[PDB]
Amino acid sequence: MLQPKRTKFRKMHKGRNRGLAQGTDVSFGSFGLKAVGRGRLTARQIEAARRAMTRAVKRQGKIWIRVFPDKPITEKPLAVRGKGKGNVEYWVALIQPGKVLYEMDGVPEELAREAFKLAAAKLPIKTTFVTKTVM
Template identity: 65%
Template structure:
């Protein structure tokens, strides 16, 4: 799964996702793309599951680009632990995605195959 090799800080604030994406809104590599419509945090597991769904459907023809990277650590405390005593340890990594951001790009496949592949990935 995707995660940074090293980071400046171990833990990050939760934050909010405001506004539309400024960059990464146009297709740069492929002929077809999957674009975000809502602000959301997408986990590394979700990115990997979508990548597998797309590559299985296109059957190794064409090329796939992943345009987002999970660079924000999300921390959580273990179950049945009392409040206080600091922030929990990092559990997983997410990418903060704004509306309009291109998530995946495809090239070298027919349009109808790309459409079904992106529909499966979006589930």
């Protein structure tokens, strides 16, 4: 479960999530899982997908996670009415279309495709399989 070791501030404005992603190329491995949709990825989701991927490849090759959950999300407890911002409960990464979420190397393409499909089944956002390009 990824989460910043420390932060300047405990709570963050909701903000919005417009635009296209930066970091749209396979930069470290040979294969990638890329977001086609827009949304939030919780640390639990990132880790559930990481587990699925890693077990699919039998801990062979190498795996990079290109996104990090650095945005804290607060909630108000049940049966509370104002009275200040709620408590931080989990952490998310904001995802825009085109964002490469994970990369893989050191395995055959068919196995990478299978592992990535198993991983995408854990995620709330539509994704697509990509490969490294020379330019």
